[PDB]
UniProtKB/Swiss-Prot annotation:
Protein name per UniProt: Parkinson disease protein 7
Impact noted for substituting residue 45 to A: Reduces protein stability. No effect on oxidation. Reduced localization in lipid rafts
Lipidation (S-palmitoyl cysteine): 45, 52, 105
Effect of residue 178 to T: No effect on detoxification activity on methylglyocal-adducted CoA
GO cellular component term, pick one: plasma membrane
Site entry: Cleavage: 148-149
Length: 187
């Protein structure tokens, strides 16, 4: 069967860190659900790009389980993810069933908020490092993409392609990732 990705889209999400993974994962033949944290209404992203979710998180979370849960960054997006009881429940379930969790830029600070993947090697945006490392619950990495078991993290808008291709490699293997990569004209 095709792998399934849940992308949780909150107000203030970084639209590049949302659209690049959704697009690249769909190129890989992954079934992606863009789920609105606050419901099914269009979401105003950090730079005012307005994205219409596929479903509410409320509905999407009843259609589990997912092979990957994806947390985009954007400071205000990540804060909304950090404060959500529904996000807490989804990540704990994913961690318990040993499913992949992927977070980019400020996104991984939602893992800290929900006590997900403590003891993992992680990266964040340089500006999110202090917040992520509060209490020393993770070991910090400067790699553009970091994968420690089922915690996959990445640094910024400019690592979004590598982040997305790492998710594709984890779910569909190196060959599919290489096939999806070539037509993107990456460096």
């Amino acid at each position: 069967a095709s792998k399934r990705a849940l992308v949780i889209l909150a107000k203030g999400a970084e639209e590049m860190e949302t659209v690049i993974p959704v697009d690249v994962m769909r190129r890989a033949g992954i079934k992606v659900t863009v789920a609105g944290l606050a419901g099914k209404d269009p979401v105003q992203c950090s730079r005012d790009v307005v994205i219409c979710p596929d479903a509410s998180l409320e509905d999407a979370k009843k259609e589990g389980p997912y092979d990957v849960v994806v947390l985009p960054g954007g400071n205000l997006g990540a804060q909304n993810l950090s404060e959500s009881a529904a996000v807490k429940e989804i990540l704990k379930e994913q961690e318990n069933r040993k499913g992949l969790i992927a977070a980019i830029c400020a996104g991984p600070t939602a893992l800290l908020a929900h006590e997900i993947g403590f003891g993992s090697k992680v990266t964040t945006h340089p500006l999110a490092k202090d917040k992520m490392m509060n209490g020393g619950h993770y070991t910090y990495s400067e790699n553009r993409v970091e994968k420690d078991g089922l915690i996959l993290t990445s640094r910024g808008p400019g690592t979004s392609f590598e982040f997305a291709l790492a998710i594709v490699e984890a779910l569909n293997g190196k060959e599919v990732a290489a096939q999806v990569k070539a037509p993107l004209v990456l460096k």
